[model samples]
Target: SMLDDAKARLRKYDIGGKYSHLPYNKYSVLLPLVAKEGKLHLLFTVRSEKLRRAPGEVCFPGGKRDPTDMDDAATALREAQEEVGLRPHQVEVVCCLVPCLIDTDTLITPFVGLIDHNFQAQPNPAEVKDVFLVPLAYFLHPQVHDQINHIFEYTNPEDGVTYQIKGMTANLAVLVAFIILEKKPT
Candidate 1:
């Protein structure tokens, strides 16, 4: 199960230093997972276009780290609770990935957590437009993996000069990876 596997992966790493020294600040997103029907399900949100950052982007329920937060985990859980009405006690944090630098400024930490199946979600209408779940089984299909592609774009952060921005079909990749990673063995 993801709870066991994710915990095992986190034990071997030290993710703290990856962003501590950066000139810019850092943020995090929680990738909440739930085990159901012997398979895992990933939960995500469609951000409202009105949001200042990543508006209309498909994202996990999370945001920038606040000074009041005790740590990254606390920030993730707090954001999840605020954005989706998920309580801290309802989740079991399993593992966290190293901070990923987006646009060379926003440092994003992605945490993987497990939740009980009975938990209900209520996404904040101010920030999220839709809440959805995708089956992990669909990601494991061989044909889906073969269709993965990466697209590129160029942007100049120096003069606020932004040009073509290169981004992979991330939504597709997320769906595929979730399927592959959560697929249960027969």
Candidate 2:
């Protein structure tokens, strides 16, 4: 199966074993992948407008690792649960992709997690405005109109809201699609 094959490939590039020694402000994010209508979609959250940092931006459910968290995976799962009500038990974390360094200090690690398509998300209003999913195929075969520079624009049919997928969020999506589909965005 395509998903299984992709998971295997991801495991080989696991950031936990490969890049864990890096000293930085470590953060972990769960890149939730759910299958819908025979296609895979990635889950994202819109940050609450009231938040002071990066408010209203589209990003995966994740945050900084707390001292109590056992590992990067634990941090990812915990943050996902808090932000979007995605329980750790409901997610099957595939692998941690290579961590990326942002602003020359923060190291952001992305953990690919397979989640059930039927899962209903309860976003925390104080932190998240809403949750949505974008088809993985959209990132795989990007159109000119949908992208400018590194920013990708997507309008959700369900909410009728346009999202600017950029920065780390956009890079991670494209990187995951490239690893699975093995092609550059065309």
Candidate 3:
């Protein structure tokens, strides 16, 4: 059942509207949901500065799909494996979300997955600057969403500073944050 659901969502022609055609670069990102100690967290990566594009930005593990890729899930899992050492078997794909256009020419599709175990991610220095985790619960609180700014930032307490953060979060994060909270609230 799991593998079937994973396969069904990756069909190419399934895209809609204008994205269904033409010059946009196609990408698939993996949203790895880690469940632990009765709680869950969403993992993210900071891109290595050496990379020419979007270096040092907070992003999910993903990249451009090669022509030879078997399907969309293959591309997403392949990139995740390259950047974070996650094998396809370690992941359970739920579904793909609406594709986002990063210009008139770049379509980034996010695929949500649940990581079966808390496997430590070893980052590739050439691609990942760092790795971090955010409790699925933290973003569940209303105040966090209400407080999001144009470009989000926070200081790592120990050294007082490090890399900052910026992006929107209606993906697996917002979904789980609220889907989780919706279960039963105080």
The Cα RMSD of model 2 versus the native structure comes to 3.0
Write the residue-wise lDDT of candidate 3 on 1-186 in tens digits: 423432343333233333434567888888788776656677889899999988888888998889888877778899999998888888987666667777787888777778867588989899998887766666544332234454334444456554444454434466545544444433
Count of backbone collisions within predicted model 2 = 0
lDDT of 2 by residue, 13-120 (tens): 675657765788989999998888777788999999998989999999999988988888899999999999998778999899878788888988899999965679
lDDT of 1: 0.64
Candidate 2: segments with Cα more than 4 A from true spot = 143-148, 183-186
lDDT of each: 0.64, 0.85, 0.69
Candidate 1, 1-186: lDDT as tens digits: 555764554445435545554766767778787776676666777788788877766677887788898878788899999888899889987656566766876777777777777788897899887666644444344222222553222222345432211132244335335434643455
TM-score of 1: 0.71
Q: Which residue runs of candidate 1 sit more than 4 Å off their true CA positions?
A: 1-6, 9-23, 142-185
Q: At residue 91, what lDDT does model 1 achieve?
A: 92
List of clashing residue pairs for candidate 3 = 24-105
TM-score (all chains, Cα) for each model: 0.71, 0.89, 0.75
Clashes of each: 5, 0, 1
TM-score of candidate 3 to 2 decimals: 0.75
